[PDB]
Design a protein around this ligand. Structure first.
Ligand SMILES: NC(=O)c1ccc[n+]([C@@H]2O[C@H](COP(=O)([O-])OP(=O)(O)OC[C@H]3O[C@@H](n4cnc5c(N)ncnc54)[C@H](O)[C@@H]3O)[C@@H](O)[C@H]2O)c1
Ligand SMILES: NC(=O)c1ccc[n+]([C@@H]2O[C@H](COP(=O)([O-])OP(=O)(O)OC[C@H]3O[C@@H](n4cnc5c(N)ncnc54)[C@H](O)[C@@H]3O)[C@@H](O)[C@H]2O)c1
Ligand SMILES: NC(=O)c1ccc[n+]([C@@H]2O[C@H](COP(=O)([O-])OP(=O)(O)OC[C@H]3O[C@@H](n4cnc5c(N)ncnc54)[C@H](O)[C@@H]3O)[C@@H](O)[C@H]2O)c1
Ligand SMILES: NC(=O)c1ccc[n+]([C@@H]2O[C@H](COP(=O)([O-])OP(=O)(O)OC[C@H]3O[C@@H](n4cnc5c(N)ncnc54)[C@H](O)[C@@H]3O)[C@@H](O)[C@H]2O)c1
Ligand SMILES: O=c1[nH]cnc2c1ncn2[C@@H]1O[C@H](COP(=O)(O)O)[C@@H](O)[C@H]1O
Ligand SMILES: O=c1[nH]cnc2c1ncn2[C@@H]1O[C@H](COP(=O)(O)O)[C@@H](O)[C@H]1O
Ligand SMILES: O=c1[nH]cnc2c1ncn2[C@@H]1O[C@H](COP(=O)(O)O)[C@@H](O)[C@H]1O
Ligand SMILES: O=c1[nH]cnc2c1ncn2[C@@H]1O[C@H](COP(=O)(O)O)[C@@H](O)[C@H]1O
Lengths: 360, 360, 360, 360
């Protein structure tokens, strides 16, 4: 009855989060007894598996503080001067589940590129007290990224470095050999991303998260699942497939703590959201779009809802912690099954004249 | 020519009712010679395979009386004070194919939870003379449900108990060992249900109905197929896959006997219909939506139409009774075949400028 | 390179006409050198493979005359008094590729049921000079149809009888043993049919046409492909899969010779079209809808377009006659390939702001 | 990890460009170091892989000059007098990556049919100095085309002849034996083509491009991929599957250099675009539609964008030239993976209220 993850993904099919479900297990505990403790890198641990994306319409100091206070972490974007990014990290560091360091200050992440401006940008961020840095690229398996990783681990031996983006075990081997402390996974699955239309390169997100995690777990390197998360079930699926944490953009967009002001159109409230490879953000080929997302309220209200939903999902599948979810996934005890297009219709809201969908 | 059910469902695919058809057989009898007699539990038998769902917008005493008079049964909902549910059961018991007990009163079902308030609710329902009780949960394979079943079978040895919801043979083993008299099958396939999108857990309904019934038939325990029934063909498919009875919500919603008033919107008549896990019905995470369904008239006219349609379907496939349909299915005499997206388009109404679809 | 029909259909998939294509061959002749001569029954031959459906919104004497004059045949419907159907057959018989009998009168077909009124209806049609009769049923594998066939072949040994509808080789065995002269194939594929929705019984049309023809060719019994023909490519596919002739409803509906008046709605011209199992046409369960189809002009203009299109299709696949098309299909010389949903999008009109589709 | 092209296309599935992706490789060079040099025929080489289609709404002398100046080539259409086509070729020959001949004049292509008017049309095009000629047919594997090829290679031994259209290795064998210098590939995949609807004959474009190229590479004969190119990723996929050059219609339609005037509808600017087999372009059966495409600016701006996009795609997959892309594809070093319908949705723009899509 059911299929194990190894035989679900080694079929060669192009599986996404919407193409499968997890089969229910046995329940002998309540939902809020479930532990969501998660390893971000080899040496940084969070109370929750949630990470904010380093985009200029998603993460500044206000978003980073709110994610850290709710038990996650925020990565500040680099579409600004080195001075500005360092000042934002300083505001986070100088501000029950809160994510904190050895001095009891909030944890903060930052993003950098792989050019020579980024070697100076790194120094300002290290002086500002950054806890972890992510090399922000579409295709992280490059000589430019490998030279940047080898430079950082020599200059600042204490710093935690996240490599990527990657979608295959061959790409992960080079970055793990180069000494990264974690891997960012996904290519083209993001809500605002058109990289697969424009360059024919990418991967369906569920098989990518599963494949890279199966290779990376052998070296003690955790995986961050990034792009294409639309709901709490997508977070549960990403963690169940081997990811240690989940990074999101559009799902945290249009919250009170996200950068940019609110506006009105068609009688409803909106906030701007755009890809870092859109012409708006940057002979010059575009890799993303710019648009808008509906208002979602404060992260101090929305993150507790995601936490309750992940706990309820772990209870339905029979696991007391995310560590136990991944252990029963790799051992073949957790079970999955595919969905046909008809099953996807049967699984959504159907056969009603009209309906109202409130989540919490 | 064609595939048996055993080789149709052991392929590992995510099959739903819309993904297959039943191949025609040989006809040597008229349609109204077909017998629809069905076992609800180990000791309760109905003239028809139809069951009303225990939802607050579907089953109260008026709905339960009409279903029993038409040869089916109604399960009264528990989103009310225990006094009110016992009084509704009392009104059903105080009221040619009618479903009745040894005292010649109509048969009545009731629903309860698995908390400690439900031990008191159970005693009032037993006082009121209830014939069968269903433990109403999204994931019935739990210590809470198993302790509730073992308590009921000791306190009232005469009472018939229905377990679930379940979608796998591993879940059914625990409830059959605990002593249930029938199993409720389905998770997330309901018209008003978003559990699969919020918690990533569930199963396509046709494979769930087929697999739980194949395990349960060996212990003499019948199966009730619940959620995702849109038409008479779905009822015929559910019974052909091994189910003894079929439970529906939205298909019996907006009938004259269902609870709640009628109202007009967009020039047409409607009645409210909602999931028991919707915020409207019940820090708190929603598992269903609330909406509306178009008016359908009285169950005293609508149920006879479903009965005639199931008889016509049994005639087309060559069987004189539902018992014979399940016997031909398990022996490999009955045949099935898959449908691609193009076959589903060819099977619906197509190639017309406009059309009118009256069923009876 | 490519797949033979035997290995395309013995995969167990639910294939429809839209799910595959025919691979091109070698051309050494012009398009109008192709011969479309087709056997309707064991003793009736037509210049073309086209047959009009016996529906009350499709075939009366005017349609039957035009179909016969253009090289096909028309089957008159039975939703009228036996007197009226016999008078319509009389008007066809009383009237360069024209379909004619030994007396040089036009050929005419008629439809009858399997009840005892039909034994009298048959005699009026036989005296009216009918050339062939079809038993008009949704599921022709019945004791009622077998007794009717055995009665007709004894009463009128000269009469040609078409059995069906069938979709499997097991159904065809009984009717071929009973002595039918041809088989009508298809169940639920028609434009106005909801039999699969309501009774769960039917079959995808391309696999049904292929499987019944493969069994029937061994006894010299031809096959008529009926229901779900939307364009000339569907006619070419039906003939290539083993059918001797193709029957259509909606494709010949709203022509000048079809019964019923024209009317205007939404600024365009329409004619009524309905299923024989719709409540409009006939305690009672509906098996079809009633609607409308856009005007197509005269059959004396429209049938020549279908003839030219089938000749062009035979030229592209490399065959000088329909006999040679079926010979290369059964020998494995003709090749086919499957289509994914994306291939169906690439195969239709795509990537335009607006367009106009003119066929001839 | 991933599938090679040989095992992706030998599955028998109906694959299109949208049904797969290319997995990323290793990067150790910048994007504008990538070489796009491409062989058009056995003796003509271009700086870029881009070709203009010979359609009356796409290629006249203005379009041919602009494509040649940007490093590609244009084929002039033949839906005009032979005198007019020769005069257009004359204007192209009379006019840093520019495509040129031994006399340092721009390269020019022309189209001809397989009738006896075309033997005279050929002589005027040779008079005018044409560099290459394409035999313009829907099904090029015919006695008419083979006699035309054998006539041209004897009359003008210096002329380069392109055969087709073909979609199978059996069709290519006859034209390669006849002595063609290149093959045009595709049937029914074009934006304005309904050949698969009307004649049931054609092939999904990605499998056709891959299979004809695998057979043709053994004889040193290059392949031109024609029809169904919607974006830069489609060009990258076509070249990666073995094509030497890519031909497009709709993607170059509504540019400043394309023939026909601009017009306004619904507040936007448009230009007419139609299939050569539409009734507008030419008892007669249509094989294409006529419509409109939105304005796209000058080819001197649009072609550089396509060049930058193909270079970026080659960089993401790890290749310094198109020659190396095809070498990694045939050796099994390049990797691909399939996409389910859900993966195609995840890969496009999703989960936004509104968005703006600018490419450059
Ligand atoms: N799937 C994804 O994750 C994805 C896809 C597209 C864009 N994006 C987002 O958009 C942003 C842009 O991504 P990107 O990949 O263009 O960033 P990038 O700076 O790596 O890309 C610039 C290009 O210049 C080249 N380059 C990079 N570093 C270099 C160096 N040191 N020397 C010489 N050449 C060098 C690379 O080949 C690269 O294609 C990213 O921050 C990312 O978050 C993400
Ligand atoms: N697929 C489905 O069938 C489905 C899915 C969702 C909701 N529903 C409907 O919505 C209603 C709500 O379903 P539900 O599963 O939330 O009901 P429930 O009362 O079982 O759920 C409440 C939660 O509290 C916990 N719990 C239950 N009994 C307990 C006890 N005795 N002690 C301690 N903890 C206990 C359980 O872990 C459960 O998740 C149901 O009546 C059902 O009809 C159905
Ligand atoms: N897929 C299809 O081809 C399809 C499906 C539905 C309807 N239809 C059309 O609608 C019309 C109605 O079809 P139908 O199958 O209902 O016709 P029918 O007269 O065969 O059906 C009437 C019912 O009465 C019973 N019956 C038939 N003859 C009998 C006899 N001699 N004695 C006792 N009982 C008998 C049969 O079991 C049948 O279900 C047909 O003419 C057909 O063209 C076609
Ligand atoms: N998939 C495709 O590539 C496709 C499909 C349809 C149309 N088209 C376009 O439309 C145009 C029309 O295509 P077409 O195939 O009809 O051109 P065509 O001139 O080859 O077709 C005319 C028909 O006449 C016949 N014929 C051709 N040459 C002959 C000769 N010398 N003697 C006797 N008979 C002869 C052929 O059988 C052919 O079907 C083409 O230029 C093409 O670009 C393309
Ligand atoms: O412009 C872009 N194109 C493609 N991907 C991008 C772009 N900008 C950001 N991304 C990715 O998109 C993710 C956010 O996707 P989302 O959570 O689905 O909304 C980011 O974390 C990046 O991995
Ligand atoms: O809130 C909810 N979420 C999910 N499933 C529910 C909920 N409430 C009821 N159900 C299920 O939905 C079924 C009715 O589904 P329907 O017949 O498709 O309309 C019920 O019998 C329950 O099994
Ligand atoms: O009411 C009905 N329900 C289902 N099938 C029918 C009905 N009436 C006619 N048919 C079938 O529909 C065919 C016509 O289908 P069409 O060519 O697709 O429009 C007829 O020849 C019959 O086989
Ligand atoms: O009328 C027609 N029907 C079918 N295919 C055609 C027709 N006219 C041109 N073609 C093909 O369509 C291609 C252009 O397709 P596009 O690039 O997708 O817009 C041409 O290069 C021809 O191969």
């Amino acid at each position: 009855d059911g299929l194990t993850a190894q035989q679900l993904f080694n079929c060669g099919d192009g599986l996404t989060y919407n193409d499968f479900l997890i089969l229910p297990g046995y329940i002998d505990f309540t939902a809020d007894q479930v532990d969501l403790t998660s390893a971000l890198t080899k040496k940084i641990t969070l109370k929750t598996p949630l990470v904010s994306s380093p985009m200029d319409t998603v993460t500044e100091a206000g978003m980073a503080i709110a994610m850290a206070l709710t038990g996650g972490i925020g990565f500040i974007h680099h579409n600004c001067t080195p001075e500005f990014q360092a000042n934002e990290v300083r505001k986070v560091k100088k501000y029950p589940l809160a994510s904190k360091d050895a001095k009891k200050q909030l944890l903060c992440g930052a993003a950098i590129g792989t050019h020579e401006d980024d070697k100076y940008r790194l120094d300002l961020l290290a002086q500002a007290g950054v806890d972890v840095v992510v090399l922000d690229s579409s295709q992280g398996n490059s000589i430019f990224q490998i030279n940047m990783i080898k430079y950082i681990k020599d200059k600042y031996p204490n710093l935690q470095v996240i490599g990527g983006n990657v979608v295959t075990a061959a790409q992960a081997k080079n970055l793990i050999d180069a000494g990264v402390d974690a891997l960012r996974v996904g290519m083209g699955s993001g809500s605002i991303c058109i990289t697969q239309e424009v360059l024919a390169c990418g991967r369906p997100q569920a098989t990518a998260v599963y494949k890279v995690s199966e290779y990376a777990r052998r070296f003690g390197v955790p995986v961050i699942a990034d792009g294409g998360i639309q709901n709490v079930g997508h977070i549960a699926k990403a963690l169940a497939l081997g990811a240690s944490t989940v990074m999101m953009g559009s799902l945290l967009a249009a919250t009170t703590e996200a950068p940019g002001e609110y506006f009105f159109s068609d009688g409803i409230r909106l906030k701007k959201y755009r890809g870092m490879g859109s012409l708006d953000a940057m002979i010059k080929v575009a890799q993303g779009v710019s648009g808008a997302v509906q208002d979602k309220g404060s992260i101090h209200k929305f993150v507790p809802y995601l936490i309750a939903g992940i706990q309820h999902s772990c209870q339905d599948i029979g696991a007391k912690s995310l560590t136990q979810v991944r252990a029963m996934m790799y051992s073949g005890e957790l079970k999955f099954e595919k969905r046909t297009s008809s099953a996807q219709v049967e699984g959504g809201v159907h056969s009603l004249h009209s309906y109202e969908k409130r989540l919490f």
